[PDB]
Amino acid sequence: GGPSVFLFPPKPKDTLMISRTPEVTCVVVDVSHEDPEVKFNWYVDGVEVHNAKTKPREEQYNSTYRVVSVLTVCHQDWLNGKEYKCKVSNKALPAPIEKTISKAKGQPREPQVYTLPPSREEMTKNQVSLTCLVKGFYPSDIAVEWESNGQPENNYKTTPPVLDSDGSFFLYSKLTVDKSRWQQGNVFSCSVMHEALHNHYTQKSLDKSTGKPTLYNVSLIMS
Amino acid sequence: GGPSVFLFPPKPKDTLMISRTPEVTCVVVDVSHEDPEVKFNWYVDGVEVHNAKTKPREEQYNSTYRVVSVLTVCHQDWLNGKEYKCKVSNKALPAPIEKTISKAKGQPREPQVYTLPPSREEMTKNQVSLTCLVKGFYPSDIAVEWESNGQPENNYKTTPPVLDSDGSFFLYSKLTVDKSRWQQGNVFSCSVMHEALHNHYTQKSLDKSTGKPTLYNVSLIMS
Amino acid sequence: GGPSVFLFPPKPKDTLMISRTPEVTCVVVDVSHEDPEVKFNWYVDGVEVHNAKTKPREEQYNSTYRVVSVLTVCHQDWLNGKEYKCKVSNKALPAPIEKTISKAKGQPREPQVYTLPPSREEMTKNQVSLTCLVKGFYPSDIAVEWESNGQPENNYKTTPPVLDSDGSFFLYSKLTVDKSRWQQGNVFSCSVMHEALHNHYTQKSLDKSTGKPTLYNVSLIMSD
């Protein structure tokens, strides 16, 4: 098998709340220069799709030759768990290689999201870090975005999911903001989007005064 | 006999979010008995669509034939506000009739969502009323839902949108609950889905913490 | 072709206000211009009234005429719930059409009125909104009005009544004002008028204080 097939699965974030149609690419890399032409076929539930698209070939700095294809896929189709196959045939390869993509067949798990107020030591520094974690989701396809007024901040960072003993997944998201803005009591939240969650959207509000509502500052004066 | 043709827009809750399927339909009422079969044609921007289907006709109490045709739509297709054409052609009908359905054009305005605690006089009664209002949205298409941490409820009523002095619509939603769960400190969240909102979703939660006393307290002195 | 008579029941605020008690409106549209004569009849409790009032017809572009007529009758007579009948006769209609209008029949219920103070998040906005909700009134006849002793408020918002699960009705009244006026402890109330309510008037004034345990934030002074 001379030519190789590189499959790019659709972005888990893209298939969520509608921004653009997710794209899956069945790129053909390591194509021999003797026979640049490649035969490409479809397999979707036994019926060929009518939205076939192709892109011009690109030649890299090295000897590797790539052929790239693009698609449009409806959001509801991916959630249905349909089976997809892109078949690549070439003269150089003796027999075709099979790489089939489909949604994971696992039991959905409802995830839980929590927020942690910054520590006192972080108050010493000029930057304040806000952390929120999401845990208990069996599928690895999830999105977390720190949402504020107007355009969301791009400073947020998300760690990859880590497997747990129970078989679920957990991850953290950290956002660094200015120290001065923290005392203003601005609203902060990290929206978590998962397929198991209701409406695929959940939000948790984090505020300085929400950590502890206990009454304070009691003064007594005796003559 | 010249049957009447009625057009209906898809439910917004179908359109703005993913899993629920939005279908467009153009219904016919008072179809002549001579030709019960009615020819329906679906056009999207002047393009034929093969995915549209028509349910079989049924006989009603008023002896009037009703034929319903549904066409699947994409969320981005309705977001772009593309024109849809329903063409009705019948043997009894002397001339086919074409109807156009399109999204209303307007300036998207971000709505503000607030929650009001129950009144002191109202909490004495067995039933407790929780109100969540959304204001300042120019389009008339908006969805309001009530839920808690456990599961969504169903005893919620949403008032129809009404005009304002500026022109932006505003409305309220009321949920009736028991005092036993309300006094235990249960979160209640109203979710608003609007086109102008970020990710077409915005949740506002209540933890019965409204009217938190200030940190400062009145000093006590002795004479 | 044939004229169509639309039913406009009296607005309960019209019944409540002294000046507009007697007015009852019959409205007819799609009147053919070929026939100039219009016959109007009022049947109160099954009998004809001697006096009548009818304004001149209004011309419409689409070969139609609008006829509005006013009948005078005591407000207490309408409050009794007796049926009223409007008859409109014209040459275009082969036979006269009789329309019956009456108040909704049902068990009267005493409505409940509650005011809500503005949320903390709203003082960010320049304009502050006050809400007064009414609920649990089976009849659709209700009148909610915002009132202040210093000066009546120009702004007034009211949603249409919404049917409840038990069969009653509920709605809200909204008043937007300035932050300074609300902070200065201005007196606001939502007068509610219903047929079942005693004296047909209920006032629920809203106070500036939110009932928080600490609002003074000023050290007290002891004097013996």
Alpha carbons A67 and B70: distance in angstroms, whole number: 39
Instruction: Judge whether A161 and A141 are in contact, CB under 8 Å.
Output: no
Contacts of C212 in chain B (CB under 8 A): 211-214
C124 Cβ contact list (under 8 Å, min separation 6):
none
Q: Flag if A220 and B223 touch (Cβ within 8 Å).
A: no
H or E element, residue B79: helix B75-79
Instruction: Judge whether B2 and B35 are in contact, CB under 8 Å.
Output: no
Instruction: Judge whether A141 and A82 are in contact, CB under 8 Å.
Output: no
C49 Cβ contact list (under 8 Å, min separation 6):
C42, C71, C73
Contacts of B217 in chain C (CB under 8 A): 214, 217
Task: Count CA within 13 A, CB hemisphere, residue A200.
Answer: 22
Cα dist from B129 to B184, B211, C17, whole Å = 15, 17, 32
Is C109 touching B (CB cutoff 8 A)? no
H or E element, residue C192: strand C188-194
A97 Cβ contact list (under 8 Å, min separation 6):
A1, A4, A5, A88
Is B212 touching A (CB cutoff 8 A)? yes
A113, β-bridge pairs: A134
Contacts of B129 in chain C (CB under 8 A): 114, 133, 135
Q: Which of B19, B199, B209 sits opposite A79 (nearest CB)?
A: B19
Cα dist from C26 to A15, B91, C33, C37, whole Å = 58, 44, 19, 16
Is B186 touching C (CB cutoff 8 A)? no
Is A114 touching B (CB cutoff 8 A)? no
Which amino acid is it at A45? D
Give the residue from B142, B155, B112, B117 showing the smallest Cα distance to C133: B117
Q: Which two tokens stand for residue C40?
A: 């109007």
Contacts of C122 in chain B (CB under 8 A): 114
Is B129 touching C (CB cutoff 8 A)? yes
Give the residue from A64, A65, A84 showing the smallest Cα distance to A74: A84
Give the residue from A43, A46, A57, A56 showing the smallest Cα distance to A88: A43
Distance from the Cα of residue B200 to its chain's centroid = 12
Contacts of C162 in chain B (CB under 8 A): 157, 159-160
Contacts of A198 in chain B (CB under 8 A): 147, 152
Alpha carbons B187 and B167: distance in angstroms, whole number: 33
Alpha carbons C18 and A177: distance in angstroms, whole number: 64
Is C123 touching B (CB cutoff 8 A)? no
Task: Give the chain A residue nearest B14 (alpha carbons).
Answer: A199
Instruction: Check residue A21 and report its DSSP letter.
Output: -
Contacts of B211 in chain C (CB under 8 A): 210-212
Is C172 touching B (CB cutoff 8 A)? yes
Which of B14, B15, B192, B198 is best to mutate for the A interface (most A CBs within 10 A)? B198
Cα dist from A202 to B128, B131, B207, C194, whole Å = 25, 20, 16, 43
Instruction: Judge whether B174 and B129 are in contact, CB under 8 Å.
Output: yes
Q: Flag if C222 and B218 touch (Cβ within 8 Å).
A: no
In angstroms, the separation between the Cα of residue A43 and the nearest Cα of chain B is: 19
Q: Which of B147, B191, B213 sits opposite A215 (nearest CB)?
A: B213
Is A219 touching B (CB cutoff 8 A)? yes
In angstroms, the separation between the Cα of residue B67 and the nearest Cα of chain A is: 27
Is B110 touching C (CB cutoff 8 A)? no
Q: Flag if B152 and A76 touch (Cβ within 8 Å).
A: no
Is C50 touching B (CB cutoff 8 A)? no
Q: Which domains does chain B have, with CATH numbers?
A: 4-101 (2.60.40.10), 112-206 (2.60.40.10)
Give the residue from B170, B118, B112, B123 showing the smallest Cα distance to C133: B118
Q: Which two tokens stand for residue C221?
A: 């002074």
Q: Which two tokens stand for residue A130?
A: 């806000």
In angstroms, the separation between the Cα of residue B26 and the nearest Cα of chain C is: 28
Is A140 touching B (CB cutoff 8 A)? no
Is B9 touching C (CB cutoff 8 A)? no
Q: Flag if B114 and C131 touch (Cβ within 8 Å).
A: no
Q: Flag if B213 and C212 touch (Cβ within 8 Å).
A: yes
Contacts of B164 in chain C (CB under 8 A): 157
Q: How many residues does chain B have?
A: 223
Give the residue from C156, C155, C134, C105 showing the smallest Cα distance to C202: C134
Alpha carbons B82 and B88: distance in angstroms, whole number: 20
Is B210 touching A (CB cutoff 8 A)? no
Distance from the Cα of residue B16 to its chain's centroid = 9
C47, β-bridge pairs: C44
Contacts of C131 in chain B (CB under 8 A): 116, 131, 133, 172
Neighbour subunits, C (≥3 Cβ pairs < 8 A) = B
Residue C181 burial (10 A CB sphere; 0-12, 13-18, 19+): middle
Q: Flag if A76 and B21 touch (Cβ within 8 Å).
A: yes
Contacts of A218 in chain B (CB under 8 A): 217
Task: Give the chain A residue nearest B75 (alpha carbons).
Answer: A18
A-proximal residues of B, 17-46, CB under 8 Å: 17-19, 21
Is A151 touching B (CB cutoff 8 A)? no
Cα dist from C144 to C175, C190, C197, whole Å = 12, 6, 13
> How is A147-194 classified by DSSP, letter by letter?
E-SSSPPS--EEPPPEE-TTS-EEEEEEEEEEHHHHHTT--EEEEEEE
Alpha carbons C116 and C223: distance in angstroms, whole number: 37
How many contacts (CB atoms, under 8 Å) link B and C?
A: 86
Alpha carbons C1 and A120: distance in angstroms, whole number: 82
Give the residue from C198, C119, C113, C170 showing the smallest Cα distance to C147: C113
Q: What angle (nearest 5°) sits at the alpha carbon of residue B214, between those of residues B211 and B216?
A: 165
Provide the 3-class DSSP secondary structure of residue C98: strand
Q: Which two tokens stand for residue A124?
A: 């010493």
Alpha carbons C103 and C84: distance in angstroms, whole number: 9
Which of A18, A144, A205, A221 is best to mutate for the B interface (most B CBs within 10 A)? A18
**Given in angstroms, what resolution was this structure solved at?**
3.7
Is A174 touching B (CB cutoff 8 A)? no
